[PDB]
Write a protein that binds this ligand. Sequence first.
Ligand code: ANP
Ligand code: MG
Lengths: 350, 223, 29, 441
Amino acid sequence: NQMSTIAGDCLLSAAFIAYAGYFDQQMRQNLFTTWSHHLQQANIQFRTDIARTEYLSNADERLRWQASSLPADDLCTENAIMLKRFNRYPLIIDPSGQATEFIMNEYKDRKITRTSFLDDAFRKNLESALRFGNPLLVQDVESYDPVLNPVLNREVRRTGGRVLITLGDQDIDLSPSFVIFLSTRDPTVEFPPDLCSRVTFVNFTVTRSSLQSQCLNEVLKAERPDVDEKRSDLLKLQGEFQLRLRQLEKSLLQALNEVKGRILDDDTIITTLENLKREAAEVTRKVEETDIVMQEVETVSQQYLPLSTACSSIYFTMESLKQIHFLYQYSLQFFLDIYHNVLYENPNLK
Amino acid sequence: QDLKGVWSELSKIWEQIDQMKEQPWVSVQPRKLRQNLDGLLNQLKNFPARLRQYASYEFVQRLLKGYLKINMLVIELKSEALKDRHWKQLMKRLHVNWVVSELTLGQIWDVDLQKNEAVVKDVLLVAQGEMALEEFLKQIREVWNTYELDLVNYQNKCRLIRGWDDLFNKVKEHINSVSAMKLSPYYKVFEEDALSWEDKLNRIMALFDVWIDVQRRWVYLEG
Amino acid sequence: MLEDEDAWMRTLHTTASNWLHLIPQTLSH
Amino acid sequence: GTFNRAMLRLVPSLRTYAEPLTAAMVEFYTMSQERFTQDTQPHYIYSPREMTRWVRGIFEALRPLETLPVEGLIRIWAHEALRLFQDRLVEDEERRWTDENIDLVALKHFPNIDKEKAMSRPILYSNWLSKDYIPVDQEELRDYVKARLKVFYEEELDVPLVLFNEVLDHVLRIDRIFRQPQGHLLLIGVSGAGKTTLSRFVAWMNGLSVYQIKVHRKYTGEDFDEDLRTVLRRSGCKNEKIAFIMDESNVLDSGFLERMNTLLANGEVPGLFEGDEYATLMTQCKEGAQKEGLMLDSHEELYKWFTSQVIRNLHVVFTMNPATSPALFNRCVLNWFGDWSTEALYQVGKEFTSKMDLEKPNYVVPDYMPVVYDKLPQPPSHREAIVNSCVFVHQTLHQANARLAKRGGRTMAITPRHYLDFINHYANLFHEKRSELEEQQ
Ligand SMILES: Nc1ncnc2c1ncn2[C@@H]1O[C@H](COP(=O)(O)OP(=O)(O)NP(=O)(O)O)[C@@H](O)[C@H]1O
Ligand SMILES: [Mg+2]
C-alpha cells in the first residue's frame, strides 16, 4: 500500500519544500490543501493525513534539533526541514534570531562562520568559505550584494582541472563542502526577483496563526494532557511507532541468529516475541482507533480555540502598542511569560 | 552462415575495442575518445536487423554504451586535480594493482566505473577541495615572491615607504585566509606549508606594525 | 491595521472616494 | 529603396521587386512604431536602425544564394520582420497582431504570390544542417539541437537542459544574432528563464569564445578600457569570434554602458588605443592583414580593416530583467524571455521525471480530470497525470502570489527556477522513499 501511496506523498512533500517557506502557516496549509484536492481529483493516490514534519524527518534529527536552539513549533520544524532538504541556498527571515543560532549550532562541528553584508570584510570571508569549504551564515541580507549572484546560482566554469566561480574580479576555486545561509531580521523586506530565484525563502516570522497554534498546543499540553498525549501519538503513528517496531523486529532477528541449544535451554525465549506482539497489538489498536481519536482531539481543540485566538490578538495588540509611545516595546517572550503565568502558576486554578 | 558472419563482425568490433583499450592513459583524450566510441556505436547500428538480434552483439552494444556512459567520468578522471595521491586512494579503494606508468584506458574500463561512481566522485571531491587549497597557497607564494615595497623620495633625504594601506590589507587578508585554511576539512597535506606561511605572514605583519609607527614618528620628529 | 491584519481596503477605498468627492477638483489661480 | 536596390543587385530576378519590398518594409516599420510605444514597455523603441538591421539581415541571407524566387524573398522579409519586431514583444496579443499584419503588409505590397509557399506558420532559417542559410523544418532543428545539448552536457556545464519550443526559438534567435554583422543581442526577461544558459549554449554551439567582465570593489574605468582593449584585440587582430556577455551584476553601472554604446553602434572605440597601444595595435593589425592576404600599409586603412573585423567578429550579449537608456535598447536586437508557459512546464516535468517509475498500470482516469495542459494526451497515463499535477502546483503558486498581492501583502516572485527546484526535490524524495521502503521490504 505504501508503494501505492509514495508517488503522491513525494509530490506533495517536494512541492511543500520547494514552494512554501516564505508564506505563513495558514498560507502553507491552504497551498497544501489545494494540492491535495487536485491530487484527489486526479485519482493520484496519497495518504489523506500527510504529516509533513514526520514524513520529511525522523525522531533522531528532531531530537538533535531540539538539542540545538530550535523552538518546538510546527512552523519551526517545517522551516528546519526546509533548511535540511534544500537545493538552493536558503534565505532565513527570522525576526528574533533563534533560527540563526540554530544554524550556528547545527554547523558548529563544520566550523560555520558568521558574517554580515554590512561588514567590509564580508567578501574576503566569503572567498575563504568558497575556497576552503566551510559553512557561512551571512546576515543583513536586506542589503544584498549582487556579487553573490554567481555563488547562489552555482555558475561554475571548469577550466583546466580547477573549478572556478567568479567572485568580484577574482576567480575563486569552489570547494565541494561549501554552503551559505543568507539571513535577515527584517520581516517586511522586499527582494528582487533575481535573488528570489537564486535563494529559497525560509520564514520564521510569528504571525497571528502561528502564535494561535502555539497557544493552542500549550493549552492542550497544560489543561488536557491526555488529549495532548493522544495527538502526539497520532503524529508518532506516521512512522515512529513502526520505526521502533521494526527496530525490535531487527533485535528479535539478531537474537534468533544465535540459536544452538540455548533456544531450548529454558524454552522461554517466546517472551521477547510476546513483547513485540504486545507492542504490535498496541500500534494496531492505535491504527484502528485513529479516526475516533482524531475526532476527539479536534473537538477538544475547538474547545480551547477561542482562548488561542484571544492570546494571538492580545500579543499583537501588545506589539502594535509601540506606535502609541516609544516605551511600549513588548517582546513575544514577554507575552509568553504572561501566558505561562496565566496557565501554570495561577493561584485561581488551585 | 548468419552466425558465422555475426561472429566475424563481433571480432572486428572487439578489435576496435581492444585497439581503443591499449591506448595509454597519459595520451587518452576524452573528447576524441567519445567521438570514436560514437563511431563504434554507428558501426553496430549499420549491422542488419537479423544480425542485431544476436545476444553477443547486444552485449557488445550495451558495453560500448556503458563506455560512453562512463565517458563523463573519463573527462572527470583525466584532470590535473587528481595528482598521484588521489590516484593512490583509488588504487587502495579499488583493490586493483595498477601501474601508473603502465596505466591504460583498458584497465580503468575493466573496473566498473558505473558501479564505483561513488568511490570516484568521493576521490574527485577530495581532489577539488585540496586543489583549491593548493592553488591558494600558489597564489600566496606568487604574490609574496613578486611583491615589492613602494618607495617615494622624501625631501631628497631618504626613500620612505608608501602604500601602507595596500600592504596591510594584503597581509591581513592573507593571515585571515590562512587561519580559515586551518579550519578547512581538506587541511591535512597542506598543514606544514600553511604553518610556515602563517609564521612568515605573522612576521611580515609584526615587522610592518612597528615599521610604519617608526616612520611616522621619525617624519614628525624631523619636521 | 497592525493590531488586527486580515476589510481595511474597502473602508479606505470608500473614505478616499468620499474625500475626493468633497475636495474640489481644481483651484483657479 | 536605395539600400534595397543595392542589395537586390546580386539577384537580378528580384530587381523589379526592389521598389515594392522597400514600401512593405517602410509600412510595417511605421505600423509598429505607431502600435507599440515606450509608455507600455520601455524597450518598445523603433528607429531607422531597425530598418538597417532588416536590410542587413536580408542581405546576409541573400548574399551566398545564387538565385531566389519572389516567394523566397518575401519569406526572408517576413523572417527578418519577425526577428526584429515580434521578438521584443512581451504580451501575446501584440505578437499575434505583428504576425497577422506581416502577412497583410506582404500580400498588400506583393500581390499574386503563393502565400502557402512564401508563408508557413513556423518560418525558420538556419545553416546548421546545410551549407547556406536556407529555410529548414522544425523537426530536424529539434533533433540537431538535442544532439548538441547532449554534447554540451559533457563539455562545459553538466546540469541537464530541456529543449522545448521557447528554448529552441531563442536558440535560433541567438544564432541569427551571432551570424549578423555587428549583431548585438539584449536578452531581456524574467529571472531564472534561462537567458545566461541559452546565451552560453549558443555561443559554445557556434564556436564563439565567451568573455565576461569581472567588476570588483570600485571597478575603475581604466580597467574597463583595458578589458575592451583585450576584447577588440582578440576580435579584430586575431580574427577570433567572441561572445561578449554582460549581466546586470555589471550592467548596472551606466558609465561603462555609455562607453559600450560606441562599440555597439560604430564597431570601434576611438581613443581606446593611443600612443604605444595604438602602435602595437597597428603592428598586430598589419600582421593579421598579411596573414589573411591584405597588404594594407597605411594606418588609416589598417584601422578601417580592424573596425571591419570587430564588426564581423565581436558580438555583445546583454542580459537583463524587466534605467537603461533607449539608445542601448536601439543599438541591440531585443529578445524577450517570458516565464515558461504551461507547455514548457509540462515538457520540463516530463523530461526531468522520466527516470522516475511514475507508472501505475491500474491507474484509473477520473471523469472530468482537472487539466492545466490543454494538449495533454486524453486519456492520460499516471506519469502524465503526475506532470499535470506538477504544472498545477506551479500555477497555484502563481495564483496564490496574485491573491496575496491583491489583498495587499508582500509577495515574492515564482521563477522557473522554483519549478526546477520542485521537480528536483520530487526526484530526490521519490527515489529516497522508494529506496527506504525497498530495503525495509
Ligand atoms: N531549458 C532549460 N532546461 C532546464 N534547466 C534550465 C533551462 N534553462 C535554464 N535552466 C536552468 O536555469 C538555472 C539558472 O537560470 P539562468 O540560466 O541563470 O537564467 P537567467 O535568465 O540567466 N537568470 P538571472 O541572471 O537571475 O536573470 C540553471 O540551473 C539552468 O540549468
Ligand atoms: Mg544570468
